[PDB]
Amino acid sequence: MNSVIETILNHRSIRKYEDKPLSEEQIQTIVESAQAASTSSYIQAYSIIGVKDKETKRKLAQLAGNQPYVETNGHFFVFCADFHRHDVIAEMEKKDLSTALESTEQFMVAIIDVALAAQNATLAAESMGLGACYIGGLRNELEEVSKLLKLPHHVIPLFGLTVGHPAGITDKKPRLPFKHVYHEETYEPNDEQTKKELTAYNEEISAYYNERTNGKRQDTWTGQMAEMLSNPKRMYMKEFVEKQGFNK
Amino acid sequence: NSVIETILNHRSIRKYEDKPLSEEQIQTIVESAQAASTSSYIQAYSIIGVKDKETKRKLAQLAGNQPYVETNGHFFVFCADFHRHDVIAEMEKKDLSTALESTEQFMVAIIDVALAAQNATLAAESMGLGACYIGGLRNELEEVSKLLKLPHHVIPLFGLTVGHPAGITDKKPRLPFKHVYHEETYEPNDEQTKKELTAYNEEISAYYNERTNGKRQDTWTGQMAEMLSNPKRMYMKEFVEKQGFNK
Ligand SMILES: Cc1cc2nc3c(=O)[nH]c(=O)nc-3n(C[C@H](O)[C@H](O)[C@H](O)COP(=O)(O)O)c2cc1C
Ligand SMILES: Cc1cc2nc3c(=O)[nH]c(=O)nc-3n(C[C@H](O)[C@H](O)[C@H](O)COP(=O)(O)O)c2cc1C
């Protein structure tokens, strides 16, 4: 494969960094790379908050569920869905844009917009020899996160992005089989076939954990999924998102 | 570097050769998509490859008559997928419905699909292919879902056309770095936001003026207000719920 494909395939989430800041040029390059992503209808429905203040990074680490790589890294970015910019447009153009901005369709548009930009930011950071990790943990405390970043109405944090010089190495995490995720023409019609593919993946995941922990853990992927999904959390999300002006 | 150069070279391609990709190129794009980070190892997506010419024609019509959905190297349909997790619920004998039907998990699934799609786009572009996301599929989700025979808990979010370009197009200017990127806190003054949008409007107006030889000089705020004052796909909340999401 070419340079781009080799970098994409080399990815693993890095959770241990040097306490050494990135240069302004590295930060700008990451952001400009994020912006170059496709955007539905040229909407650019995102904002990125860079956090360098040590006191704020420490509070964000605690809010994310005590993730120390949010406090100790090269830079911390907060990726936000942003329709506040479009509320400003509504005033400039003297047109009511609320029906569209508050709709489920636009909420999906904003989430996609942010995520495409974030993945470009991740790849740009990784191509510069930096480690990266998405921080969905911020969603445990979106109200407190929003207050710390002084977000106005119609701006929601979706996740953080830690970047920096790695202070260690980790292995690649095996993904579901290509032929399981990718379907030709139509979705897999037989659930017994899906179970069969998940059973084979479980054997791979169990062996992967067994080898990496020297037998301490042998969790199957379906076992791990059922464990987390049977304990629903962030149930305040529907109400928080609506209060912010989205998915109403 | 080459990853950054490729990222920055992006432009949506809407004119392709009617020449199919190899199976190896299709697999490479999908394996690149899968290598994206995934919330809690969830992998809450499925990708449907469409090669049937009759189906590509119907999809092009459902997308709002976008002929690059019919004529390309390959057409992918990116789906949010919790049906795989419903299968896990039966295998593990655990009720996962509260989490799977929540707004939080709906956000998780959308993010997961989009990160995978952006890796698929970059992999395709690095191979000299043109690419274009097709959100147009969202005009007709029930018909799209029926054509792809999607079960419960699977929703198409957008298509992805790829192929050998049959033409060239320019790069679309983005909002200024200093406008999108904020240090520590969000921009506290809306008068500052208006000022920056006025300057961006001058850039966008000049960009359209130069590319159309004066035929169009649309501002970005003008273009945004025009589309956003005419709400469409208002059936979306109910359709996504009917399929088990965001309840
Ligand atoms: C999720 C998504 C859906 C899109 N849907 C369409 C579509 O249906 N048809 C199309 O021609 N372009 C579509 N696009 C491409 C955008 O119009 C394009 O990214 C934007 O105009 C900026 O242009 P650029 O990608 O050339 O920089 C979509 C982009 C995204 C991110
Ligand atoms: C949107 C999103 C949010 C995530 N949130 C967290 C988080 O809060 N903390 C963490 O350590 N990892 C988080 N991750 C990383 C995933 O756990 C990781 O991508 C997954 O376990 C697969 O491992 P890999 O990225 O090393 O291949 C997140 C990933 C995504 C895509």
| DSSP SS3 for B164 | coil
Task: Report which of B9, B170, B184, B79 is spatially closest to residue A33, judged by C-alpha positions.
Answer: B9
| DSSP SS3 for B189 | coil
Where does residue B176 rank: exposed (0-12), middle (13-18), buried (19+ CB within 10 A)?
Answer: middle
Tokens representing A59 are: 């509070």
Task: Report which of B174, B102, B129, B133 is spatially closest to residue A116, judged by C-alpha positions.
Answer: B133
Ligand located closest to A9 CA: 2
| Residues forming a β-bridge with A157 | A80
In angstroms, this model's resolution equals 1.9
CB A110, CB A83: distance < 8 Å: yes
Which chain A residue has the Cα nearest residue B42?
A225
Report angle CA B196, B197, B202 to the nearest 5 degrees: 100
Distance of CA A104 to the CA centre of its chain: 20
What is the distance between the alpha carbons of residues A193 and A168, in angstroms, rounded to a whole number?
A: 39
Start-to-end Cα distance in chain B: 44
Residue B41 CB less than 6 A away from ligand 2: yes
Residue A87 half-sphere exposure toward CB, CA atoms < 13 A: 15
Dihedral sign for Cα B77, B80, B82, B85, please: positive
Q: At a CB cut-off of 8 Å and minimum separation 6, what does A52 contact? A: A21, A75, A76, B183, B184
Tokens representing B71 are: 């004529």
How many other β-carbons are positioned within 10 Å of the β-carbon of residue A67?
A: 18
Radius of gyration (C-alpha) of chain B in whole angstroms = 20
Task: Report which of B8, B2, B24 is spatially closest to residue A4, judged by C-alpha positions.
Answer: B2
Mutate to test the interface with B, among A55, A104, A161 (most CBs of B within 10 A): A104
| DSSP SS3 for B231 | coil
Domains of chain A in start order, with CATH, are 1-248 (3.40.109.10)
Residue B233 CB less than 6 A away from ligand 1: no
- Strands B181-183, A46-51: pairing kind: parallel
CB B99, CB A237: distance < 8 Å: no
What is the distance between the alpha carbons of residues B216 and B201, in angstroms, rounded to a whole number?
A: 13
Hey, are the CB atoms on A4 and B126 less than 8 Å from each other? yes
How many other β-carbons are positioned within 10 Å of the β-carbon of residue B177?
A: 15
Q: Which of residues 53-82 of A touch B (CB under 8 A)?
A: 53, 56, 80
Hey, are the CB atoms on A35 and B175 less than 8 Å from each other? yes
Residue B172 CB less than 6 A away from ligand 1: yes
- Tell me which residue has tokens 């719920």: B241
Tell me which method was used to determine the 3D structure. X-ray
Q: Which helix (H) or strand (E) holds B49?
A: strand B45-50
SS3 per-residue string spanning chain A: CCHHHHHHHHCCCCCCECCCCCCHHHHHHHHHHHHCCCCHHHCCCEEEEEECCHHHHHHHHHHCCCCHHHHCCCEEEEEEEECHHHHHHHHHHCCCCHHHHCCHHHHHHHHHHHHHHHHHHHHHHHHCCCEEEEEHHHHHCHHHHHHHCCCCCCEEEEEEEEEECECCCCCCCCCCCHHHHEEECCCCCCHHHHHHHHHHHHHHHHHHHHHHCCCCCCCCHHHHHHHHHCCCCCCCHHHHHHHCCCCC
Query: Per the annotation, does B49 bind a ligand?
Result: no
